[PDB]
């Protein structure tokens, strides 16, 4: 289970979206190293221009690559569910604006870790910070709170993202998440703990298409 994460793991991400009716597709690839807690990915909007700011999709775009220290390794649900994988589902409320709903299947297919995502956004304001692309191209660190959900054989997660806005203000994105195993086998249901997450966003100077380079560093504690 955790044996699959002993070294570098290539990743594929596939997302199909519809936000306020604007359909779009994103494809991503890169690699993850759970030993370091390191994720390194590049995403391309394949249908043209992304109708939403890239930072709003960071959380949607593989927590099995979190580094769990040795004394916390029996609390790593994400790896224990591999390779058959897990369903990750979210609702994300952007304060005073729209909401996203996402369903993602994260599982090994061969040696590649794949994240396949369907995203539906509604209630966004035409002249608001998200459909107006008034979000800065950065991210902040956040703690993610992980609880067991023995009844569905998985975990529930709640956390709030602070997106920096181009005017100095901050826009909150309230995340509700649950993960349930795809496989019929047994998983690790953890005690309460959190993942400390850092994310850095950049651009490929040689990439002419609309895109985002994402680096994440993730570590468990508590």
């Amino acid at each position, epitope marked *: 289970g955790e044996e699959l994460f002993t070294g570098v793991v290539p990743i594929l991400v596939e997302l199909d979206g519809d936000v306020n009716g604007h359909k779009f597709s994103v494809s991503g690839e890169g690699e993850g190293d759970a030993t370091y807690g390191k994720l390194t990915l590049k995403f391309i909007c394949t249908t043209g221009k992304l109708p939403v700011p890239w930072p709003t999709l960071v959380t949607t775009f593989v927590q099995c690559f979190a580094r769990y220290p040795d004394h916390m390794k029996q609390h790593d649900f994400f790896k224990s569910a591999m390779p058959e994988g897990y369903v990750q*589902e979210r*609702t994300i*409320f952007f304060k005073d604006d729209g909401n996203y709903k996402t*369903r993602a299947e994260v599982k090994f297919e061969g040696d590649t870790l794949v994240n396949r995502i369907e995203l539906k956004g509604i*209630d966004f*304001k035409e002249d608001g910070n998200i459909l107006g692309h008034k979000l800065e191209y950065n991210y902040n660190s956040h703690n993610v709170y992980i609880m067991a959900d023995k009844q569905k054989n998985g975990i529930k997660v709640n956390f*709030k993202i602070r997106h920096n806005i181009e005017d100095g203000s901050v826009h909150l994105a*309230d995340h*509700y998440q*649950q993960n349930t195993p795809i496989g019929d086998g047994p998983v690790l249901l953890p005690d309460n703990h959190y993942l400390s997450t850092q994310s850095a966003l950049s651009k490929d100077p040689n990439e002419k298409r609309d895109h985002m380079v994402l680096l994440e560093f993730v570590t468990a504690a508590g």
Partner: nanobody
Amino acid sequence: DVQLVESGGGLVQPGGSLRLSCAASGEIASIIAIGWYRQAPGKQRESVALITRSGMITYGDSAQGRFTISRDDAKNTVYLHMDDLVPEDTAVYYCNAKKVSFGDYWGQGTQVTVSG
């Protein structure tokens, strides 16, 4: 399954105030947000006010600081306080409850009419 019961619609004069309430029953633990949408004549449904399990509050454009939403987590009821009402607030107000997965829960709808 969860069930939503609405009450408190009706006739009101301009400048006056109204309250809507909505009680939810059944699988309460799955609800992450509850609140209200409205649909005015000839217009598409627009979100008005929600409050999430964490207590965060989110208003659509029709609020304009005139609508307030509160939640009685004990009696699993949500309330919409609407005041300084105008004729253009005339519409059908729908209670709405959200879960993490696709697909919402909706109430039957309640008419609100503002006129002299």
